[PDB]
């Protein structure tokens, strides 16, 4: 039961102390990294650094290529609709390329390919390989195979296929009217293609209702997941829900109903699009295990499956090394704790080094209350200023003496000098509070704030 976290896959829109608390307490096996983290490279890198020290994870993204692209590291792709028009070998080569890059950064799973068919009702629009089930199957197969050669495990979505509905699951619960024989022949054809091969893959469920077949959304449907996916399609691998908070589910089922149906239906990992919802869902699952509404056997089998995927990963590559370099290259003098809860005035060079300067205020705001942000001229130095606490981000202190005394005329009792370019300048601030970063990069500045609040005090 120190293992129940293995049944959860959590999305992270931020990386902070709550994130760390949630991860350390519940130990989710899956981590999905959202744009909130990816768009701030310093946070992504520090997050990857953290994950490498806290056990083993499935780490994933939504980088499908085309319309859904979230990793700036992967060159941009026209997408599945365009790929569908072309020799499927190109899809395989793209996904190997994307996967290899992903695997180098520290990802070990991707939520792709999309295997949903394109219909005229649907529009989603560019994310499908095509209408022809055969075209979708061969591209889907090349995609799963490419991702896998590249070093990342694919997750095909969304079972059993929901291109035949006009409705979006983020808004309401959609409906697909097709008969089972039609689903089988068509929407399920590319899924069948993958299950018949030897590629390791996960499967994500659709929050979609199929009334000619069952009353429940596929995510919550024992018929679709046990009798169709496990038994007729013979899939023994990992089954993920789409995000449970999505309206299609949350506006029609309780948290406790969703967790029950999905695990009883045969699913293995509950996807939450918000790591902060984990304690509610986690506790909900724990209840249902103790009051008997969830067969214990299903939870154990699920745990077994995740453990197989976790041990498969094996990788050497983690981009978080960058965060360690930044952390370890920071030298600081001794700082008084009692200063640090005050409101800070930032002195930042005026303005690639220029974009690094522009980002210093945003990074500081994560760690300190900020009263003003002042952009000085490096060849003049800072106007005289006062405050409760002052941060001088020193660049080129030594050009002349009228600049070195702009910097030294600041109240030494409540100024911290951040020497971020030429670390020789640190000799010119004796008795002063000094941080040397050896870098202008946002991650270094970031790690300098962490040392300031932690190790240096």
């Amino acid at each position: 039961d120190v293992d129940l976290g293995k049944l959860f896959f959590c999305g992270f829109d931020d990386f902070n102390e709550e994130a760390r608390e949630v991860i350390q307490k519940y130990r989710p096996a899956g981590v999905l990294i959202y744009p909130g983290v990816l768009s701030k490279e310093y946070l992504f890198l520090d997050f990857m650094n953290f994950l490498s020290r806290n056990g083993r994870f499935i780490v994933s993204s939504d980088h499908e290529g085309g319309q859904l692209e979230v990793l700036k590291y992967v060159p941009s792709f026209p997408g599945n609709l365009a790929a569908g028009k072309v020799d499927p070998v190109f899809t395989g080569r793209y996904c190997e390329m994307a996967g290899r890059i992903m695997n180098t950064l520290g990802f070990n799973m991707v939520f792709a390919p999309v295997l949903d068919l394109l219909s005229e009702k649907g529009s989603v629009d560019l994310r499908s390989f095509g209408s022809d089930p055969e075209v979708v199957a061969s591209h889907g197969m090349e995609a799963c195979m490419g991702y896998f050669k590249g070093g990342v495990i694919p997750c095909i979505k969304h079972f059993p296929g929901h291109g035949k509905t006009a409705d979006d699951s983020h808004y309401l619960l959609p409906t697909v009217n097709a008969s089972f024989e039609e689903l089988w022949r068509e929407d399920l054809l590319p899924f069948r293609r993958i299950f018949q091969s030897r590629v390791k893959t996960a499967v994500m469920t659709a929050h979609v209702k199929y009334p000619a077949v069952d009353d429940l959304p596929a995510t919550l449907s024992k018929k679709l997941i046990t009798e169709v996916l496990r038994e007729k399609l013979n899939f023994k691998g990992l089954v993920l829900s789409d995000a449970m908070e999505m309206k299609a589910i949350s506006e029609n089922f309780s948290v406790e109903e969703a967790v029950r149906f999905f695990i009883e239906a045969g699913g293995n990992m509950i996807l939450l699009d918000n790591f902060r919802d984990l304690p509610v869902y986690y506790e909900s699952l724990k209840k249902l295990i103790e009051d008997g509404s969830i067969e214990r056997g299903k939870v154990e089998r699920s745990i077994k499956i995740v453990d197989e995927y976790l041990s498969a990963l094996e990788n050497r590559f983690n981009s978080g090394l960058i965060a360690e370099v930044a952390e370890r290259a920071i030298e600081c003098t001794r700082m008084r704790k009692e200063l640090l809860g005050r409101e800070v005035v930032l002195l930042v060079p005026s303005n690639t080094t220029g974009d690094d300067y522009d980002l210093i205020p945003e990074v500081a705001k994560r760690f300190f209350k900020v009263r003003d942000v002042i952009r000085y001229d490096i060849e003049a130095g800072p106007d005289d200023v006062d405050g409760e606490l002052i941060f001088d981000f020193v660049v080129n202190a030594s050009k002349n003496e009228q600049v070195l005394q702009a910097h030294l005329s600041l109240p030494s009792d409540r100024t911290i000098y951040f020497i971020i370019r030429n670390p020789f300048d640190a000799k010119f601030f004796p008795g002063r509070s000094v941080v040397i970063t050896h870098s202008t990069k946002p991650i270094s500045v970031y790690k300098s704030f962490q040392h300031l609040l932690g190790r240096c005090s």
Copy 2:
């Protein structure tokens, strides 16, 4: 095939670039931000290179202060790395090297081995630089990319920049050997695969010429005393340190006679001048033919040492092959175009359509229409309708169809079903909104569709 002695920088990709590459066959391609900052051009360039022989493909992505590949996560840089266990430098460079190799690069112009005097350098201690320098070369290589250490013989002792003047380092040879040269020496002795780039720097206590042009520094020191048998590159020859003190012909002569192998040009348009200059000097005897052959031999080894299956230009092929067009009248295409572009991530793709169009067509005006309405009526010599959501209703479908059918081309860039709604019309289907697709649709319009 003298092109094997040239390494060319490209700030753009166009037909001149294609002409120059096909005529002269340079062995080396260096890709500058002018191409990298436009991913559609970068991708198309890579696709072109995979079809025109073997190349050494490199960038200046050092990490830290000098970063040019958005695909590689950003690194604090060498000064920060120097403070740290050198294994981390090795890991960084493997990571960067692997990403680079996946994109299609096979060489990086890094690490910097120059010493720090009073961010691109690992430190002041020659020993620290050597250990990080070795890890970096090893990591790059492990990652799939050949490293190139720079700049021999080390020029951290000068404040002056070679982009401005010819700088001077006054240290004696005994001091260079003991200090600046030590990390270069540790690397040759460890026998890690690497290339070497020369410095456009004068060392007056040792010799009169800049190292790039100095037989003493390159032959007697680098080749003989340091025993480096590998690939030797110039820094860029057009740089003022060389160009304002030597003629093209003096620079080409000295460098090859000095023992250098590949001439780095920072501009591919200069290749013919330098190429003919090298051809001349070989014909009148100012260049020993033996040296040219030895240089060619070395280049040939690196070209085959480099393989790879990986080229990100496949993306450009997908975009190319997914384009459907009706037949187009050649003589509309020399006209001035009005663009109708959906207003404003599919929004960032739309913003970029005008920049892409301007490469292929004269553009008179750019109108940003509302796609819930469709285009206001408009007229011009030639009209490009970048159709989005044509079928919402009949008042949108008839805003698009009220445009003059003799001189409008409809680019169906999102929902390819809409194409049925434009019978008799000129229609291009891209199956994508991405700049590389839009770009490839213009090439097809000017080529295969007409």
